[PDB]
Amino acid sequence: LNNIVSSLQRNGIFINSLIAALTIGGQQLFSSSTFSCPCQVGKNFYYGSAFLVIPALILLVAGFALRSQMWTITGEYCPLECKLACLRFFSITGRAVIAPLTWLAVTLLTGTYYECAASEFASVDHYPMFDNVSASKREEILAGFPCCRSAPSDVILVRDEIALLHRYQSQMLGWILITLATIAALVSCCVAKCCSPLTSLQHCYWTSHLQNERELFEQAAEQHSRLLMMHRIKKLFGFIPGSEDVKHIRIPSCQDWKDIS
Amino acid sequence: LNNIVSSLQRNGIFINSLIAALTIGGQQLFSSSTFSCPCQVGKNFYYGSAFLVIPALILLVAGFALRSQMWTITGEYCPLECKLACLRFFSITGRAVIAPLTWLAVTLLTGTYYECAASEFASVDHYPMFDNVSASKREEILAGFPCCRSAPSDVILVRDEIALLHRYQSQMLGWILITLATIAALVSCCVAKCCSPLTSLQHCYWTSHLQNERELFEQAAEQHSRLLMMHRIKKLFGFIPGSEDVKHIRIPSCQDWKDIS
Amino acid sequence: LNNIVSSLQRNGIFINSLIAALTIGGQQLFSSSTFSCPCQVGKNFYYGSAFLVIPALILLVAGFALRSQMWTITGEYCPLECKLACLRFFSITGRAVIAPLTWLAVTLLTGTYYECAASEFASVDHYPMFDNVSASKREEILAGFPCCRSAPSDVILVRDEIALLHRYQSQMLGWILITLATIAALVSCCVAKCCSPLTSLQHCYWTSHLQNERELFEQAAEQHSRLLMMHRIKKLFGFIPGSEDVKHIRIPSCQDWKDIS
Amino acid sequence: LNNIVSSLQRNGIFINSLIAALTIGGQQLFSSSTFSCPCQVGKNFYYGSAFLVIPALILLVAGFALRSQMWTITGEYCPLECKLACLRFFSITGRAVIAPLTWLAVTLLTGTYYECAASEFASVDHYPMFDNVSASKREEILAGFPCCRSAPSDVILVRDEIALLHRYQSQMLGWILITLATIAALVSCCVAKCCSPLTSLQHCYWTSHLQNERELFEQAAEQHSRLLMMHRIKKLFGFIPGSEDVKHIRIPSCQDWKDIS
Amino acid sequence: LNNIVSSLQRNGIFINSLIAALTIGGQQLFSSSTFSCPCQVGKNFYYGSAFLVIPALILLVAGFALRSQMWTITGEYCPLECKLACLRFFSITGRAVIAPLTWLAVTLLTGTYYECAASEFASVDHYPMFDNVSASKREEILAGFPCCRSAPSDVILVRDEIALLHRYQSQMLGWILITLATIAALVSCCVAKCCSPLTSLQHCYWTSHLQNERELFEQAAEQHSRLLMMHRIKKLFGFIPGSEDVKHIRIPSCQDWKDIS
Amino acid sequence: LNNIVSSLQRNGIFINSLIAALTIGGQQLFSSSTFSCPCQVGKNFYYGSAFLVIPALILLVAGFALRSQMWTITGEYCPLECKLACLRFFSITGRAVIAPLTWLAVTLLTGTYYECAASEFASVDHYPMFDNVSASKREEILAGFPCCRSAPSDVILVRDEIALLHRYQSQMLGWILITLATIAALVSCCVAKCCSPLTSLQHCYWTSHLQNERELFEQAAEQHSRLLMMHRIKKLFGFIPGSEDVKHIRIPSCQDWKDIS
Amino acid sequence: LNNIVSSLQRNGIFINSLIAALTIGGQQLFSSSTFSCPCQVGKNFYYGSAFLVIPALILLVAGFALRSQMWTITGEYCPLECKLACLRFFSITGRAVIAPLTWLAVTLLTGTYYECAASEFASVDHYPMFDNVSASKREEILAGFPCCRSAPSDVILVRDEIALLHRYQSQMLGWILITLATIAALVSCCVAKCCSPLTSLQHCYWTSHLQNERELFEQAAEQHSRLLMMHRIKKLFGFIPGSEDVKHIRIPSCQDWKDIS
């Protein structure tokens, strides 16, 4: 049933779902463990922006780089060959895109990252309580109350209202992002089908050709080197390894020990 | 017994039930985790409408796109051929429809999404407490009390009455939607049977023909490419992989290394 | 022992019991989760009537439609042929009837659905407390107290008495319904036996004939199409798939790639 | 060991015990869940009588109807043939009787059903507290206090005494019923043995003859129809299903597609 | 399935992930157990710097040294040979780098190590509370309050603000470090591909050649020495070990006991 | 899979990790159970020094002695032979060093042993509270407060400060020790590779030669003695043990009983 | 894998570790259960001395006696024979020494046994509180307070100080004992290697010779007696046991019954 399991894995839906589930679980643990939104007035946008974009960028780069087909494409690039390379790049891009989109969607829908990032950019014209002719303390309290200030001094109404505003903006932005991602994925698949010179059956043949040629060469390269080394050590020790050699044995010489080395 | 399990899966009832159960569980977790109905006076209908329709639209698109038969139909379209394509589209539409209908039904029956969406569209003529000659504060409180306002000031009677009204309207709308979906499904199946030119036995033969032809070509395309590459690497290394080659081995040349590449 | 398990399933008693148990469990979860009886004076009968009849109607339609034998009967209909079709319809009707009868029986015996449905149709002549010369407030309170009003103002005695009256009427109606269903089932089986032209042994032979003919044609249609496609692709690639083809291989031409497509 | 398990099931004691245990468990759940004895003065005897007799009648009818041997007997009826049919009817009646007797015994021994049924028929001559010259309020309170009235007004002594009287009468009636059932079962078995024209060994032979003839005809009817349809589809597709057919294949014609249909 | 498991391990992604997970778990236990940040005014930077860099340096050295290929490269070093050695060094550097980068990233993101390290380097110009004309007590309290001082004397506002500043700086530094590590890894892989004289297929052949030659020589060196010693002890005891020797046995002499020793 | 498990054990990393883990667990149990730091003014340095060095010395001696290769080296010692013995000593020293280094590192990092050892050597010039012109009570209290004195008399500030000083010194000393151990291990491995006259492949051959020669001689010494004794007892009892001897049996004589003894 | 398990047991390290672990567990249970240090002024040293030395002496005697090789050595004793007997005695002494050393080490390190043993030998010159011109009550209280006296009368400071003194002395004595035991074991092994006339390989041969000769004689003595008795009873009953004897049977005579007895 292992072969049946492998056939099931050959479908990209299961693997992409598994990657998305791992991203969701990892994001839950990571955010609930080590977020600790700072209260710093000077630089607080960088904290949220890093916590929101850097993991997505890392996951994107990992999804692209960890695929050996991408290294082969880059080696080829560094007519029909161009279209074939573009098709392989698209096939890689499927996973390379499902990897970080889950992170961005989950983080935006939770909204805490976006809140901690864009808290300080809130407006104060609507709220008469934020006059603050000093024009410097207002910025500090604006960047301060989202984090840990608490301190109920009847300003918490404005805090709660603006926090709900930023949470709503975050979740709506997440929905916009996921809708755009889905539309882009569908359009990209349609463009790949339209621009592919190979027919559907020819495309299937070519994909299987690529997979099988790579696997076959790997296996037979292993077997060829095994045979060549086995002949070499047959010369070295007077027998082929793993076979009945009580007939004859060899005594290597020091210069022969140099030759094998 | 794995073959028996596969035969059971071949029935669409089990798979559709599994999809519906996953949709119900996912909706429960998603709604109980990250709903957080906003209190914003300006845009609150968009929040509920997005949370109610966007997941359904995404699930519909996923159900249609993830089926490779749909890509084959679109490739063909892009007499009897038209009817056959329509029949295959209907067979895909079965799953493509069971996927989001569960989401819409569960969300409407729970009613919280519809409440948060259409709270602000409530009438005030019936209730004398909502005179509010200002005609602007009334809209804000109307969009505000459903979310988190609480603040018992004896208006909570009107809040509770209108909340029950919207919940009842939501659940009745859900029942109307599921009844219409069932009627449409039954009528569509009857129309498919009436409009199908193939006989019942001929239809069964054609369906099995399609499945078997696709599977057979996939397998033998794999095997043909395996044989062709195996002959190529037999030329390359002087032996066929996976067989007894102690008779002879090859030493590839650099230009030959270019040819295999 | 899998074959023994299949033989046990061939008895309709186990499958009908399994369907009834699933209906009971689903009704328990559904009602205990999302009933929320409304307090609306205008339309409250529709709520309960929908929650009581719509699931039963959906389950009835599903039981009839999900059976492929029903599609075959409808295709035939759209002498002895009429009686044979009627017998097959009855065999389908067995499951199509056990599916929703469990829902109706459980919902009526619990009585909450019937209470929320027919609360507003209660009489007030017996109770002197419901004079209400206004003749409009009385209807509203009558439709209101069953839901969530509570508000002990010594009218709860009338509320409790009428609630017990409606609960008793609901459970007695459920018993009447289940008794009528059992009597109708027994009479229908007796009428089927009386009206069947086939003898008992002939009826058994005919039933097994139908099942076996459908299964055999499905299997051999699969195998015939497999053989035809296998010959086609033998023409295409110069070999039969899944067999030793190191003797010869083919190089398809583009026009031949068109022919296979 | 599955065959040994089947041999154990062939003994009626285990199956009858299993049916009785299921009846006891189902009665426990059903009564502890949805009894809710009403307080209605007018009709309260019908409630208990239905809850006490209707399930027993349904179980009796199910036990008789679900046995296919009963349908065969009814088909025969609709000399020695009469005695043989009577013997088969008795063999069916064994299970048809053990099915509801458990329900009646358990319900009477618990006594709550009988109490709620025959509460209103209690006498009042013994108790001087029930003078009630009105002669209408007395009936209402008599039918009311058993259900949920509580309301300790020092009449609860009479309530408790009459409740104990009805509980004792219920349990004694249950013992009378089970004793009569056992005596009737033993006498019926003795009468069956006396009136049976077959000898003991001949009776065993006849019972096994009946079982084996029915099973054999079912199996070979299946196999005969399989062979006939297999020959038909051999004509249709030019080969027998499930066998090596690479020698020849057929191309059905539309009129031939009509003939197979 | 053990062979399949080995094939999965052959992918570096799983092993690198396993190493990173072990580093994370070990860091969690180690830091939560035995950190105990000191309060010493004189030397407190050394404590955090050691706890932050020494484990990373040890893990780096272990990753490089524990790989026997590194010992082989160092033995060779102590044209194309240089490039081949550089490629092998890079292949080792992959694991040698994933080993401590996890430690540095986790420790910086947690931030406690960096806080305890660079607490004393905080500025005091911004805070008017830290005038301290003594200019020596200020340094001591600055190095003291992060550790365990507590002692709320309304200076804890400055403590909390500067602690948040250092935590934010630590986490941002961790993000900078991980981004630089990823960029360096990608650039190094690209430079390795560009500078490699071998082709992609030739590179695969060479890697498999190296692995197979080392494994083959290890095995056959074992077998050669086994044969040589077996012949020696055949001389010693008059028979080959592990074979039927009831034909003849030997009695070793003391001088022969010296020869074997 | 047992052979695969043995191959995994052949790697020293797993065994060294297992030894270190056992040392950590044993140290945890031992220290948390039976430390009980004394308060004795006279001799308290000896207690901590013993608890810190004696287990390490015992583990070092056990690691060296328990290896039979060490006994063989000592027997040889008691040109190339010297270098070969040095290489074998180094191979033993690997485990002999990983055994106690874990104990020293864990004990120093915990710091309690070092605190109890070097408490009395603390300075008193910095602290004006320790004037104590008596110059004898001061030493006693200095050696006393670390253990169990408690007794808060506002001197606990000095106690806590000096305890933190000694804990920091202990952990820094542990880091210095582990860094020096790692540097020494790496330098020793490099010196072993540089000073080894054998080539890398020759070194592998020699190591496998040593292991195989020892194992082979052990096995065949067992088999030779088994054969010799078996012949002796064949003389004694007239038959070879474990074979069909119903042909003949012997009756030993008393003088023959002496000869076998 | 049982043979592999036996090979692992053949290493003395595992068995000695198992013996030490059992000694530790048994000591824990025994001491925590039934110590109950007495308060008797007269004889309290004997109690602790017995509880500390008698189990060690018993374990030593058991380790020596339970080994049958020791009985063989004593039988031989009761040139090279002397050295061989000494070597076998040393091999026995390994286990005979690891058996009680664990008990002594654990008991001394816990220190409770030594405290209860040597409490009464404490000095009183240092403590001015123990003047007690009576010179008899002082001894009684000195032997009394360690056990159960409690009775805080401000003398508990001296009690605690002297208890810590004796605990420290006990644990230091335990460390001295274990260090001396390890040094003696290493020196004894070195002396055994130096004084052994056999070479290392000859020593291995001799050890295996001893084990194999004893096992072989045991087995074949069993088989010889089985054959002799089997022939005897073949004479007795006319057949060999466990074989086909339907050919002939015997009827033993009473005098023959005497001969077999």
Side-chain angles (χ1 to χ4, degrees), chain G residues 162-183:
Chain G
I162 188 96
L164 293 180
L165 190 271
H166 278 166
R167 207 190 195 280
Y168 149 78
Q169 182 178 354
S170 172
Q171 300 197 182
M172 261 285 318
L173 207 157
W175 287 117
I176 296 302
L177 186 268
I178 178 189
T179 303
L180 293 214
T182 301
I183 293 300

Side-chain angles (χ1 to χ4, degrees), chain A residues 43 47 233 237 239 245 250, chain E residues 164 168 171 217 220 223-224:
Chain A
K43 34 192 71 173
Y47 190 90
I233 171 184
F237 287 158
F239 69 94
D245 40 0
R250 256 295 305 269
Chain E
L164 293 180
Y168 149 78
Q171 300 197 182
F217 181 88
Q223 203 204 270
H224 183 281

